[PDB]
Amino acid sequence: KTRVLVVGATGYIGKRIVRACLAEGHETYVLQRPEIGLEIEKVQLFLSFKKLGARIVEGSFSDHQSLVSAVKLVDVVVSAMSGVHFRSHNILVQLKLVEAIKEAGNVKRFLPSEFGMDPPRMGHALPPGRETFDQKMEVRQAIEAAGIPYTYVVGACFAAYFAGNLSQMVTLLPPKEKVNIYGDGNVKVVFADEDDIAKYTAKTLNDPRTLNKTVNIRPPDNVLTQLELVQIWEKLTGKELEKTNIAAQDFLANIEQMEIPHQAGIGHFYHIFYEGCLTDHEVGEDEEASSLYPDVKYKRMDDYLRMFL
Amino acid sequence: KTRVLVVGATGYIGKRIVRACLAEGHETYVLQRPEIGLEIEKVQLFLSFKKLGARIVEGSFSDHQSLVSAVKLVDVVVSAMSGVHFRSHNILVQLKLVEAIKEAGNVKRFLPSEFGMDPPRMGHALPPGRETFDQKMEVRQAIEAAGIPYTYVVGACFAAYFAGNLSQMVTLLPPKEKVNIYGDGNVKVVFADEDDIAKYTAKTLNDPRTLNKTVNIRPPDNVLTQLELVQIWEKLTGKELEKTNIAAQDFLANIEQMEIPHQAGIGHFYHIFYEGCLTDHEVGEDEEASSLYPDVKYKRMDDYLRMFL
Ligand SMILES: NC(=O)C1=CN([C@@H]2O[C@H](COP(=O)(O)OP(=O)(O)OC[C@H]3O[C@@H](n4cnc5c(N)ncnc54)[C@H](OP(=O)(O)O)[C@@H]3O)[C@@H](O)[C@H]2O)C=CC1
Ligand SMILES: NC(=O)C1=CN([C@@H]2O[C@H](COP(=O)(O)OP(=O)(O)OC[C@H]3O[C@@H](n4cnc5c(N)ncnc54)[C@H](OP(=O)(O)O)[C@@H]3O)[C@@H](O)[C@H]2O)C=CC1
Ligand SMILES: COc1cc([C@@H]2OC[C@@H]3[C@H]2CO[C@H]3c2ccc(O)c(OC)c2)ccc1O
Ligand SMILES: COc1cc([C@@H]2OC[C@@H]3[C@H]2CO[C@H]3c2ccc(O)c(OC)c2)ccc1O
């Protein structure tokens, strides 16, 4: 019944948002941009979205009128535009979609590509990693400057990037024998299975309680320190890892000499694991996903980590 | 009971071979290399394989003994090494895998990364695209010099790359109004759904009738000229396309000025659509997959194209 267009449909979180939308019963449309020519994996993703009942909608960010038509077909727009330097970081491209929405005037709600650290709260962050927050704030201000009703989904680390690897930067698998603990390891971090983030997204986009609101993904059982997450892994394996504590001064040493994308990752990690930006402020139950949607039975970090045994 | 090691598990056809091996009931092992630590999509394929019952085996082509130890665990090795210029063309890396298979001595059969044009018949092929057939023949010669038992799966155009686009290059979708036709369009081409290719592969690797044989994938109902292919789409859509014929001399014009991966593609199309190298020779029923495995209800091109509607 609610019509939803997903932009960034074949992206990491986007393809999950698409599926979650179909599973929730939204009439679901996905923007197929024509610039994806020989990218066979994207094409076949679109093919499989259609098999499950998504509706292809052709459009391009180089064709302002195509964006206008596209968003004219739906009540809700969800953007999953890319925003990670080691992949690509085109948050600002959404500006064109905001103004398409402005001109079209039918969109009851817009969800921009947030799904992470809360932008309004990273004003102190260090470049280059800060470009993320600023660009999202740039889009937030364009949304509000056009009066577009909105929901911002913030709050949780993607489990695949921060849990499955015990928060080590070199990899996405657990370490064999040795692990680095950032600082004392006693700073709470919020972890969420990406399928849960998508599930909450699909449940909130037409929840009246989240209209013009920031929704936090902070499921209580998944608020864990890094030493706590490493300890779940040690339990699951019955083996203790050699832990080296890394001080902030050492984690940042010679950052100036590193490639810009890695500097940005280091900056993001710094804010999460040394400053604790995801848990350094409180949020009530009228703005937290697992409390707004208690039937969602979110995966806990131990079952997430069990897949890696 | 047949234990297969798939090298190239996450590749385009490789991941399809992984799942076909599982569905066929082979005890299925997949080589997970440590170099792919930060490619999220590959890491999560390995997880998805695991959940299906595949067995993870760690090994690197930069660690000869890891390869030896890898191939020691299985009866059959299937290689799906990359070999397309606009993706990756590393056929010759298999030579190290061949060395390992030689040293290990237990392997009952090897399937090298073939799955296309039949290399020994591409003697007179145009550079740079000729690179593909020369590297596969250099690999073939190491397999036989080393007395390794083999099966070569050849003969079919991947349907995604030649059928879902009506054989239009540099796109993967059917054109909306106009189609180019190479020559008169009456040269017979062989098309196969890549899942049928993987299923035949999984079925042939423990088939006594195909030990040390070339196996052609030439499903008779999918032996089509390009015009017949185009006419199937026209009947699905109910819309006639405006057809422009393109002579060999204009298709090949100024080839030397092309990005050399496009030179490789041009040459490959030329051999397929202009010289009919996939249909210029007959093959017996004792060496053709649909005839060896009639229980496989292979997808025809009308059922294939219904996905693009
Ligand atoms: N731990 C956390 O909390 C994390 C948060 N995030 C955030 O998730 C959001 C999405 O991240 P992620 O899923 O990796 O993004 P992706 O790299 O996966 O890209 C998503 C989509 O962006 C579209 N895209 C990329 N470039 C362009 C372009 N020039 N023009 C139009 N469309 C483009 C593409 O859409 P199309 O499908 O049309 O091709 C692509 O599929 C980001 O804000 C990111 O910061 C992501 C990582 C972790
Ligand atoms: N119409 C036709 O007949 C077609 C035929 N083909 C043929 O199919 C075969 C597979 O092609 P395709 O599926 O596109 O292959 P891909 O390009 O998708 O790559 C397959 C695998 O090759 C592995 N790989 C790549 N580089 C290396 C490397 N340096 N060292 C070790 N492993 C590497 C990777 O394995 P890993 O997953 O472990 O990381 C990769 O996943 C090729 O011979 C191709 O020539 C391909 C296109 C069309
Ligand atoms: C938790 O908030 C965010 C998370 C990220 C995800 O941390 C920045 C990124 C990212 C995932 O890719 C993370 C990252 C960057 C560099 C790395 O080496 C890395 O290794 C796992 C992981 C992106 C933006 C955010 O606001
Ligand atoms: C059919 O046998 C083969 C086909 C190929 C096909 O053509 C080169 C590739 C593989 C897939 O990609 C085809 C391709 C090349 C260039 C293009 O522009 C293209 O557009 C669809 C498609 C490669 C090796 C083969 O043995």
Residue numbers in the entry:
A (entry chain E), B (entry chain F): 9 to 317
Mind quoting what the paper says about this structure?
Pinoresinol/lariciresinol reductase (PLR), an NADPH-dependent reductase, converts pinoresinol to lariciresinol and subsequently to secoisolariciresinol. Here, we present crystal structures of IiPLR1 from Isatis indigotica and pinoresinol reductases (PrRs) AtPrR1 and AtPrR2 from Arabidopsis thaliana, in the apo, substrate-bound and product-bound states. The crystal structures were captured in the apo, substrate-bound and/or product-bound forms. We found that, for all 16 structures we solved, each enzyme adopts a similar head-to-tail dimer conformation, strongly suggesting that each PLR/PrR functions as a homodimer, consistent with the literature that TpPLR1 exists as a dimeric entity in solution. Each structure contains a head-to-tail homodimer, and the catalytic pocket comprises structural elements from both monomers. β4 loop covers the top of the pocket, and residue 98 from the loop governs catalytic specificity.
In contrast to IiPLR1_NAP_ + PIN, the β4 loops of AtPrR1_NAP_ + PIN and AtPrR2_NAP_ + PIN can be clearly identified. These well-defined loops twist as an “8” shape and cover both the NADP+-binding and substrate-binding grooves. Within the twisted loop, His93 and His97 “grasp” helices α5 and α10, while Val92 and Phe94 interact directly with (+)-pinoresinol; Arg95 strongly interacts with NADP+ as well as each of the GXXGXXG motif and α2-helix from neighboring protomer of the dimer. Similar β4 loops are also observed in all other AtPrR1 substrate/product-bound structures, whereas each β4 loop is disordered in the corresponding IiPLR1 structures, which indicates that the β4 loop may participate in substrate selectivity and, hence, catalysis. Furthermore, Leu46 (corresponding to Val46 in IiPLR1), His276 and Phe277 of AtPrR1 are positioned similar to the corresponding residues of IiPLR1 to effect substrate binding or product release, except that the β4 loops cover the substrate/product, which are disordered in the IiPLR1 structures. Besides the β4 loop, Val46 in IiPLR1 is replaced with Leu46 in AtPrR1, which has the effect of compressing the substrate-binding pocket.
